Paper text:
The epidermal growth factor receptor (EGFR) is a receptor tyrosine kinase that couples the binding of extracellular ligands, such as EGF and transforming growth factor-α (TGF-α), to the initiation of intracellular signaling pathways. The extracellular module of EGFR consists of four domains, denoted Domains I, II, III, and IV. Domain II, which bridges the ligand-binding domains, contains the ‘dimerization arm’, a loop that mediates the principal interaction with the other subunit in an activated dimer. Domains I, II, and III form a compact unit that we refer to as the ligand-binding ‘head’, and Domain IV forms a rigid and elongated ‘leg’ that connects the ligand-binding head to the single transmembrane helix.
To better understand the origin of this apparent structural heterogeneity, we used 3D classification to further partition the entire dataset of 765,883 particles into 10 subclasses. When the rotation between the two subunits is small, maintenance of the same conformation in both legs would lead to steric clashes between the two legs. The clashes are relieved by one of the two Domain IV legs undergoing a hinge rotation around the connection between the head and the leg, and we refer to this leg as ‘flexible’. This hinge rotation causes the flexible leg to swing upwards, closer to the ligand-binding head, increasing the separation between the membrane-proximal tips of the two Domain IV legs in the dimer. When the angle between the heads is at its minimal value (~10o), the flexible leg swings maximally toward the ligand-binding head, increasing the distance between the membrane-proximal tips of the extracellular module by nearly 15 Å (the ‘separated’ conformation). Thus, when the transmembrane helices are in the N-terminal dimer configuration, it is likely that the tips-separated conformation of the extracellular module dimer, with the tips of Domain IV at a larger distance, is favored over the tips-juxtaposed conformation. Dimerization of the transmembrane helices through the N-terminal dimerization motif is associated with increased kinase activity, so our structural analysis of the connection between the extracellular module and the transmembrane helices suggests that the tips-separated conformation of the extracellular module is associated with a more active conformation of the kinase domains, through its coupling to the N-terminal dimer of the transmembrane helices. Compared to the EGFR:EGF complex, the flexible leg in the tips-separated conformation of the EGFR:TGF-α complex is destabilized. Due to the more compressed ligand-binding pocket in the TGF-α complex, which leads to potential steric clashes between the Domain IV legs, TGF-α is less effective than EGF at stabilizing the Domain IV legs in the tips-separated conformation of the extracellular module.
Residue numbers in the entry:
A (entry chain C), D (entry chain D): 5 to 51
B (entry chain A), C (entry chain B): 1 to 614
The structure:
């Protein structure tokens, strides 16, 4: 979806999207990970 | 009950945490039953029939407020009073409401934040939400600061026009929603001509203290609604009352009875313990370069320094490190000999893979030895990726304390998760001052449940979440229990070296049962269960005690010349004093070195004055 | 703006200095061309037909104002605006006017204090001045704060009847001097409840800032007439702006471009050299009890000593000693082992006779040797009395610095006047920081001009005054001019012991004609005109010089052996090294020291094993 | 004038007097000496 300038953007098996309206890019973090690039791990709610 | 509940606030701007049901759950777990968001309030991807009624409790947001990509009908932020705007979305907005619609143009319709009265910083932005009405009637020069009226950006093109009228019982056709309660209540553009900040009515005798932030109830500093600066236990000061008041008459300072320490946006009478009490009477995280931790009677002040001032480098994020988000192979060098991290550590899987979106090359797993010198962490240590070749946290064997100034998710200070290491290897960790310990999700890691973590906790209320590691009844059946000689407190690894405390004796780091007092070459002497070898001059008797004290003043017989309790290997040969009596010694009958005489001018290479020829 | 001409202000309290003609001359001397009385203003015994056309510039009195026992009819305290009332007369009042009548009831009549508005502290007293009308009209609720309206005592009685009624263009019967220029201006009891401080009108739009004492010109704090607490060179702050601000977001202090050191009752960019700079920015006269002075950084900060530190005792005129005139026989005990004096020294002839008023018995002469411990002093030195039996100032032979912080009459640090002393005896004096010196009136003293105090005055503007001593021609012609061979530009005694400026050189505490270069018994070198002995290990050079420094590193040739850069007496043979390994060396051809073979434990007399048999 | 309870009160040859009105005692310092009780020498004008 998002061009190869933003490849490997979303860490931890991310699904990088393209926001149509705001004309920006974003991530689709797999469950359990938070952050703008899905970098961290949601420690409070699992291992 | 004045300790109103607080949140941490998300910081993932436009990302989606899973699906629409998983993201909405993550939104609920965060902001359910809390009144003061300490970070940001982001509301994205919330579809229809999801009830956001849990938001009606929020009363203050210390950062921006983003409301985007929703398709819900109403976002009931009807108790929000202020948005301090300590952090801007797109560098200039403390409230941004963009594109709440799906591809049929039925999106947000009711944003009834009837109580929003002040935005201490930043502009406001609205865009592309073509079902929001009854908000273009809000006159936003009463809310947004007097400075930031040049960065604002608002357009309400509700071409559909499918909502009610605005009650004429409020001035200037201004209202937030329908009804009478949901309309604008003004406190800044209806004031008297003499009012300093904001007011309560129109008459000249109503202006509020110039520290009240979102209007007041009375004309004092102790009756504001929100304090636009420090708060002092009832009131809203500009600065916390200083501890000492310089007397312009006697030219000498004297203590203030109401002086208080300034800890964040609050004036507290005593700093939290893991907080550097500074000279100006204010709790700090880490004082300047020319200083160091002078722990004194409990308070962790910092003096000028111990001359040459040891290395203290900046942690990840804090300082010149906000760009990068882990220890990549571009900022590892700056940790060369740093013996104390001002900040916090982030070891993340992207550090080894090598990020292309930031261009930093992969980190070679041998460059982690640079971390061998660290001795203290002020914030938190988050470990999520370690080279599978290595078998324990070798780069942190010298780690001695984790303070816990900053924390991960505002709760955790030690975070070892999802590794393949076998034992911890933090052999020198003595104290985790503040935070919680999350050690979980490691396939094959034993020895983590034996340690008594309550012994490393500087405060009370901390707890460890140690779960889902390698099974308990699987280290017994492999030989992965530590040394029988280490005390029942615990052990980090399998060796007798990496234990918490020894049972009988210690030798450096190792734990041993019976050390070398009566046999062996290092004939030691027991002292605080750490038997050490003494003055190297006195050989072992047959089996008796070889030595009892550190120096020569305690050994029974000295293997060389015995000068009474002052044993040395040789006889003195010219000790110095007044008038310079060049007195030498020699080996008399009883092997005692006796004083020389100035008669034999050639010193004393023989005995006395009868055996001192050339 | 320009600094207002200050005058020190008398403190005599009803004491007459000299004759009626001369008492007035003293008043004419102290309060002439003065606009800010730093102390008190006392106008006593001014007799009829004596003018007071110089009191029409006093704009502010920092202490009290006493007007008593006068006989003149018009005391024109015209531009007096505020009486800060730091001190009090009768420990109650800050403006007293008492018993101003002459013999035939014709005392003070016209006291036109029209510009007076404020009295920051204390009550007012008017008493037994039977010829005083035109002040009964004033209302003492505008003037004195509401706190002291109970302590106030007023009495007015002009039995004569020649009291002119005053112009009706102002407040109901309220006039200072009969006319329209000299009637009262109310600025506290006329304004609505919405004001707190002064108020220049009845409209809530012309209110004065609370940091204004008499009255304002506009609505700001930079629009006052006189400042209430401090003065930041343009405006009336309440506390000097702090040097560093603490932001509640990043939890650490931050430099402030508005911060000012709070010196006296003003805020300055930096403080004078002789004051103790604190970290807050305060500039104190004497740092805390636990602390002790620092030496450098360009300033005189105070560090915290290492336990028992140099005992300092508060000198005369501070706290425990304010009832005491000079160092009595009683109070001399507390000066036993004081190393420095935070204060100043009054040596008064009452401390040798012993007055019965203070119940103090006479002091004994030989007690003054207790002062042989002190080494510097902070304020001034005031020497007026001294036992005629002694020929020099013996108790002061250790003093090297005179800070001159709280000087005498605001001018004099050193004051040696009218003594039977023959020698000053200042073999230790090295600098006088601030103030002025008056060496005048002594019967002999002789050596006093040949000192060139210009080299002892660290600050500028300091001047000496040396007159009325036994002239040189009458003392130099009687075998008393000081010793030769010692750079005669300086001598505090006949012998060469002192000699300020040591010839071209000096041997410690004594001056000499030349250093022991080339010849002599001890070899020496020259730096800053001082002769320091070479290291014993430099060879006596009969040709050129011997060394270029103290250490054995600067020798031209060693006396024995040479262990590298240093000149040693005997090559090391048991010195501690790395890894607990001892150190043994040997002397080769050029007496150079090289290490032994690692093996050789009993040392070695040659290279390697071919040097040590065992 | 002052009763001998205040004898020698005025130093440097003082002339202690009694103020009739105020009911107080005070000194009559010789010229050149200042202070409440003629203690200090007027250094700022002479020797």
């Amino acid at each position: 979806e998002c061009p190869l300038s933003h490849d490997g953007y979303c860490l931890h098996d991310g699904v990088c999207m393209y926001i149509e309206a705001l004309d920006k890019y974003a991530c689709n973090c797999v469950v359990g990970y938070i952050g703008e690039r899905c970098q961290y791990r949601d420690l409070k709610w699992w291992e | 009950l004045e300790e109103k509940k607080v949140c941490q606030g998300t910081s993932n701007k436009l990302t989606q945490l899973g699906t629409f049901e998983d993201h909405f759950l993550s939104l609920q777990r965060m902001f359910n039953n809390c009144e003061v968001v300490l970070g940001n309030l982001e509301i994205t991807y919330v579809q229809r029939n999801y009830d956001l009624s849990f938001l009606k409790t929020i009363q203050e947001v210390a950062g921006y407020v983003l409301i985007a990509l929703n398709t819900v009908e109403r976002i009931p932020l009807e108790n929000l009073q202020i948005i301090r705007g300590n952090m801007y979305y797109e560098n200039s907005y403390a409230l941004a409401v963009l594109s709440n619609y799906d591809a049929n143009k039925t999106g947000l319709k009711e944003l009834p934040m009837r109580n929003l009265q002040e935005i201490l910083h930043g502009a406001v932005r609205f865009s592309n939400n073509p079902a929001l009405c009854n908000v273009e009637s809000i006159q936003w020069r009463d809310i947004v600061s007097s400075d930031f009226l040049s960065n604002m950006s608002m357009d309400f093109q509700n071409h559909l026009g499918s909502c009610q009228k605005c009650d004429p019982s409020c001035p200037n056709g201004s209202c937030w929603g329908a009804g009478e309660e949901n309309c604008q209540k003004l406190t800044k553009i209806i004031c008297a001509q003499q009012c300093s900040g904001r007011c309560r009515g129109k008459s000249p005798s109503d202006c509020c203290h110039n520290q009240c932030a979102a209007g007041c109830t009375g004309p004092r500093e102790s009756d504001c609604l929100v304090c636009r600066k420090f708060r002092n236990e009832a009131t809203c000061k500009d600065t916390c009352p200083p501890l000492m008041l310089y007397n312009p008459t006697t030219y000498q300072m004297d203590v203030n009875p109401e002086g208080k320490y300034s800890f964040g946006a609050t004036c507290v009478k005593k700093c939290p313990r893991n907080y550097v009490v500074t000279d100006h009477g204010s709790c700090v995280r880490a004082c300047g370069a020319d200083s160091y931790e002078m722990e004194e009677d409990g308070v962790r002040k910092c003096k000028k320094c111990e001359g040459p001032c040891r290395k203290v480098c900046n942690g990840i994020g804090i300082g010149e490190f906000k760009d990068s988000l882990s220890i990549n192979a571009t900022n590892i060098k700056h940790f060369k000999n740093c013996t104390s991290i001002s900040g916090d550590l982030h070891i993340l899987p992207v550090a080894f893979r090598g990020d292309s979106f930031t261009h930093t090359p992969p980190l070679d797993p041998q460059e982690l030895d640079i971390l061998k010198t660290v001795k203290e962490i002020t914030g938190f240590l988050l470990i999520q990726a370690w080279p599978e070749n290595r078998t324990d946290l070798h780069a942190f064997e010298n780690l001695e304390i984790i303070r816990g100034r900053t924390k991960q998710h505002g709760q955790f200070s030690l975070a070892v998760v999802s590794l393949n290491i076998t034992s911890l290897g933090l052999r020198s960790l003595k104290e985790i001052s503040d935070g919680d310990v999350i050690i979980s999700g490691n396939k094959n890691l034993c020895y983590a449940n034996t340690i008594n973590w309550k012994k490393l906790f500087g405060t009370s209320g901390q707890k460890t979440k140690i779960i889902s590691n390698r099974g308990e009844n699987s280290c017994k059946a492999t030989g992965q229990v530590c040394h029988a000689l280490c005390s029942p407190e615990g052990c980090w690894g399998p060796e007798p070296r990496d234990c918490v405390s020894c049972r009988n004796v210690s030798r450096g780091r190792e734990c041993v049962d019976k050390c070398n007092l009566l046999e062996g070459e290092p004939r030691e002497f027991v002292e605080n269960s750490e038997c050490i070898q003494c003055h190297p001059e006195c050989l072992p008797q047959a089996m008796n005690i070889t030595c009892t004290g550190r120096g020569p003043d305690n050994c029974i017989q000295c293997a060389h010349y015995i000068d009474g309790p002052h044993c040395v290997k040789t006889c003195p040969a010219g000790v110095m004093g007044e008038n310079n009596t060049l007195v030498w010694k020699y080996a008399d009958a009883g092997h005692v070195c006796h004083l020389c005489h100035p008669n034999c001018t050639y010193g004393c290479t023989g005995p006395g004055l009868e055996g001192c020829p050339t």
